[PDB]
């Protein structure tokens, strides 16, 4: 698609986007935050150490 900016390429470009969609954007949080939301229960010491 990089070569040309015409309508001939956007068709199959959107088709391939349907085939394989890349990640457009994502919200993020530190990795120590997911430890609080685990089934293992309280992990405050390990969470603070990793923070």
């Amino acid at each position: 698609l990089a070569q040309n900016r015409s309508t001939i390429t956007y068709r199959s470009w959107g088709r391939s986007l349907k085939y394989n969609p890349v990640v457009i954007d994502f919200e993020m949080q530190p990795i120590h935050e997911v430890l609080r939301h685990t089934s293992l229960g309280p992990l405050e010491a390990k969470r603070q150490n990793l923070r």
Binding site: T7, Y10, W13, K18
Partner: protein, 49 residues
């Protein structure tokens, strides 16, 4: 016999020219529904339809 003469001349020329041109264009699209290949075809910013 006495002879005397005097001559004087002056010329002044000033020229000024200014030219300024500006043109811009903007485009905003907001489409919701059917994000398939056809709407990507229609997402062509240059052609209007």
């Amino acid at each position: 016999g006495v002879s005397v003469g005097k001559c004087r001349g002056i010329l002044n020329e000033i020229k000024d020219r200014n030219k300024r041109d500006t043109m811009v264009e903007d485009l905003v699209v907001l489409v919701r529904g059917g994000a398939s290949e056809h709407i990507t075809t229609l997402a062509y910013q240059e052609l209007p339809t």
